[PDB]
């Protein structure tokens, strides 16, 4: 769970609290791209929005609806030895917190819901582009009138339709009255804890940016009904959502390696250092986004951003010796200390000063066929690189890797600028 909170802690109790959740199915990227953009680009000014951006992260990383089955059918009876039992208990504990008032659960679904059968694409069994409640009232909730909240949220969404077919409709599943499937799902659990709970389903027939657009409209609609004041730092239209999903300023940092751009990496990165004796899901990974991770695929390690494959690492596993903190380098004539794990911009040249116990391999530069070269003490320019070794499709970013005997001492990136 990630909090979207006011800057002043005193403002937290001055408006309601929403729990916002997505990615219970790992192949529903509208939901988890919307929670990601909410976390990256919105501000909550009073009250609180608690976000679980992706509920089923292992499944997200495999672009899969659910590696362990349907996680959204595990909120009623569940065996203690279900692989997702611990995750389910964390989510139930979040939902049932006294400080939570409302829950909003995001999904992507095929076709377009209609309250009467129109055809195979548009009918009551479809889930696309609807706003869903389990029943019209939850007595004892802070906001008992789920129907009124839903209808007003639907008004807000329908004021911004991209095409008339995308019109939102209310879907009340009347779950207590015999819907056996919905009785095992998240929002019914939430109403049984006297929370006002809602689900938003964006149509899978839409492109991703348009799915995310509708999810964000639903979030904003509901926040308005709850009177949780918020801002965002962009204009809510599909172009503008697309730009933020595909933002060139997005980065990932694996272990103690430097930050790397998410987008426009080469599709494969070779001889990529990773810490040995560490399971892939335990390798630290940091990002300015909230849906990034690593997953093993045969002997490669995939860098994922939601369902997007950003690169395939061909790793070699090695001890990460953390002793080396900085390196003396000359950058464009200017001698300086550069921290291990840095990215340095280079206009013209660089030069690595020799070190007693450290060997430097500039990846893409060579002066011989030596397998473990030391390339400190060379003045290096763009023209000296074999471009195929660049990190990036643009051929501007190169790795410098440092070694102390058979251990890895760190990496610095140079970016030619
Ligand atoms: N298409 C979704 C709708 C679930 C809606 C609501 N009951 C929730 O738990 O969010 C499903 O079949 O799981
Ligand atoms: Ca922003
Ligand atoms: Ca779903
Ligand atoms: Ca080299």
XYZ file of C-alpha atoms in Angstrom, residues 61-293:
233
model
C 4.780 -9.637 -14.513
C 3.683 -12.676 -16.595
C 0.899 -10.730 -18.400
C -1.468 -13.311 -16.912
C -4.987 -13.156 -15.503
C -3.918 -15.077 -12.414
C -1.029 -17.483 -11.931
C -2.686 -18.903 -8.807
C -6.268 -18.738 -10.079
C -8.813 -15.939 -9.800
C -7.651 -13.793 -6.889
C -11.016 -11.987 -6.977
C -12.815 -15.215 -6.003
C -10.791 -15.648 -2.783
C -12.544 -13.229 -0.384
C -15.036 -15.701 1.114
C -14.035 -19.336 1.767
C -10.317 -19.866 1.263
C -7.908 -22.567 2.387
C -5.100 -21.590 4.486
C -2.670 -23.249 2.142
C -3.735 -21.208 -0.885
C -0.609 -19.498 -2.235
C -2.455 -16.136 -2.141
C -3.895 -16.597 1.377
C -1.349 -14.226 2.983
C -1.923 -11.562 0.299
C -5.696 -11.857 0.708
C -5.385 -11.288 4.468
C -3.306 -8.118 3.906
C -5.946 -6.798 1.504
C -8.840 -7.708 3.821
C -7.042 -5.972 6.708
C -6.690 -2.813 4.574
C -10.338 -2.920 3.523
C -11.575 -3.405 7.105
C -9.514 -0.613 8.738
C -11.756 1.772 10.697
C -9.979 4.699 9.001
C -11.165 3.554 5.523
C -14.567 4.830 4.381
C -14.786 3.834 0.726
C -13.220 1.312 -1.641
C -12.793 1.560 -5.400
C -11.617 -1.500 -7.323
C -10.511 -1.168 -10.966
C -10.829 -3.791 -13.719
C -10.643 -4.131 -17.485
C -13.437 -6.212 -19.090
C -14.513 -7.350 -22.535
C -17.183 -5.706 -24.653
C -19.563 -3.116 -23.229
C -22.111 -3.704 -20.518
C -25.695 -2.847 -21.383
C -28.670 -3.361 -19.073
C -30.576 -5.022 -21.959
C -29.264 -7.474 -24.565
C -28.264 -5.513 -27.700
C -25.847 -8.031 -29.273
C -22.869 -10.297 -28.400
C -20.600 -7.294 -27.745
C -23.165 -5.201 -25.863
C -25.254 -7.007 -23.274
C -25.827 -7.481 -19.507
C -23.202 -10.258 -19.242
C -20.423 -7.959 -20.509
C -18.435 -5.793 -18.098
C -16.837 -3.072 -20.244
C -17.423 0.570 -19.290
C -19.667 0.195 -16.288
C -19.595 1.325 -12.656
C -20.583 -1.433 -10.308
C -22.218 -1.780 -6.895
C -23.187 -4.911 -4.947
C -26.392 -3.282 -3.666
C -27.985 0.176 -3.494
C -27.447 0.869 0.226
C -25.010 -0.165 2.961
C -26.538 0.693 6.309
C -23.952 1.828 8.854
C -21.409 3.088 6.278
C -20.204 6.713 6.501
C -21.814 7.081 3.042
C -24.670 4.515 2.956
C -26.170 5.620 -0.394
C -24.065 3.605 -2.826
C -26.643 4.123 -5.591
C -26.580 7.919 -5.376
C -22.764 7.963 -5.329
C -22.658 5.592 -8.309
C -25.164 7.565 -10.374
C -23.311 10.845 -9.743
C -19.945 9.242 -10.576
C -21.479 7.917 -13.805
C -22.654 11.483 -14.608
C -19.094 12.719 -14.261
C -17.700 10.007 -16.546
C -20.422 10.444 -19.158
C -19.618 14.157 -19.450
C -16.306 13.119 -21.082
C -17.136 10.302 -23.543
C -14.729 9.812 -26.426
C -17.391 7.953 -28.452
C -21.073 7.255 -27.698
C -20.545 3.462 -27.561
C -18.392 4.059 -24.449
C -21.362 5.417 -22.450
C -21.213 4.288 -18.836
C -24.094 2.485 -17.155
C -24.831 1.428 -13.616
C -24.431 -2.290 -12.918
C -25.923 -3.384 -9.601
C -25.081 -7.056 -9.153
C -27.458 -7.512 -6.149
C -24.798 -9.840 -4.799
C -26.482 -10.942 -1.566
C -29.553 -12.008 -3.600
C -27.771 -14.993 -5.214
C -24.781 -13.920 -7.316
C -22.493 -16.762 -6.215
C -19.448 -15.394 -8.045
C -19.666 -11.830 -6.755
C -20.210 -13.203 -3.235
C -16.539 -14.368 -3.364
C -15.195 -11.013 -4.630
C -13.537 -7.970 -3.102
C -16.290 -5.377 -3.054
C -18.830 -7.676 -1.366
C -16.275 -8.331 1.375
C -15.918 -4.545 1.718
C -19.656 -3.847 2.045
C -19.817 -6.544 4.767
C -17.356 -4.362 6.722
C -19.756 -1.405 6.216
C -17.579 0.357 3.654
C -19.026 2.028 0.584
C -17.527 -0.070 -2.179
C -17.511 0.348 -5.937
C -15.863 -1.236 -8.939
C -14.999 0.439 -12.206
C -14.622 -1.690 -15.361
C -13.021 -0.155 -18.459
C -13.600 -1.930 -21.760
C -10.827 -4.167 -23.107
C -11.993 -3.087 -26.571
C -10.299 0.286 -25.920
C -6.633 1.079 -26.394
C -4.698 1.311 -23.145
C -4.625 5.128 -22.946
C -8.414 5.223 -23.372
C -8.939 2.516 -20.690
C -6.774 4.513 -18.302
C -8.675 7.688 -19.239
C -11.985 6.114 -18.134
C -10.461 4.732 -14.937
C -9.139 8.193 -14.060
C -12.572 9.706 -14.809
C -14.133 7.188 -12.406
C -11.539 7.959 -9.714
C -12.137 11.709 -10.082
C -15.912 11.255 -10.119
C -15.867 9.302 -6.887
C -13.356 11.585 -5.163
C -15.702 14.468 -6.007
C -18.684 12.620 -4.443
C -16.592 11.867 -1.338
C -15.386 15.480 -1.162
C -11.739 14.412 -1.073
C -10.032 17.443 -2.694
C -7.316 16.635 -5.226
C -5.187 18.034 -8.033
C -3.393 16.583 -11.013
C -0.451 17.989 -12.933
C -1.764 17.277 -16.472
C -4.866 17.556 -18.689
C -7.069 14.469 -18.689
C -7.419 13.491 -22.340
C -6.223 10.359 -24.147
C -3.170 12.066 -25.688
C -2.129 13.355 -22.475
C -2.588 9.979 -20.691
C -0.639 8.280 -23.477
C 2.227 10.757 -23.016
C 2.436 9.951 -19.287
C 2.243 6.180 -19.751
C 4.999 6.434 -22.366
C 7.039 9.047 -20.516
C 10.713 9.240 -21.512
C 11.498 10.465 -17.975
C 10.500 7.108 -16.483
C 13.428 5.171 -15.013
C 14.304 1.972 -13.174
C 17.193 1.346 -10.810
C 18.200 -2.287 -10.309
C 20.169 -3.002 -7.133
C 22.994 -0.422 -6.745
C 23.303 0.103 -10.533
C 22.581 3.547 -12.021
C 19.097 4.678 -13.031
C 18.250 3.535 -16.564
C 15.539 4.926 -18.847
C 12.545 2.574 -19.074
C 11.699 3.431 -22.668
C 13.919 3.024 -25.740
C 16.317 0.552 -24.160
C 17.727 -1.984 -26.561
C 15.463 -5.073 -26.415
C 18.360 -7.138 -25.053
C 21.169 -6.150 -22.685
C 24.066 -8.577 -22.538
C 26.465 -9.597 -19.773
C 24.349 -7.609 -17.368
C 25.657 -7.715 -13.795
C 23.225 -8.921 -11.094
C 23.945 -9.801 -7.448
C 24.608 -13.482 -6.928
C 22.754 -15.668 -4.361
C 19.660 -13.458 -4.683
C 16.295 -14.648 -5.945
C 15.058 -12.437 -8.774
C 11.973 -11.166 -6.915
C 14.286 -10.154 -4.006
C 16.627 -7.991 -6.120
C 15.971 -4.375 -5.131
C 14.310 -2.341 -7.822
C 13.381 1.326 -7.583
C 11.428 3.468 -10.040
C 9.522 6.722 -10.312
C 6.650 4.444 -11.426
C 4.893 1.983 -9.114
C 4.338 -0.981 -11.461
C 7.901 -1.897 -12.438
C 9.567 -5.219 -11.659
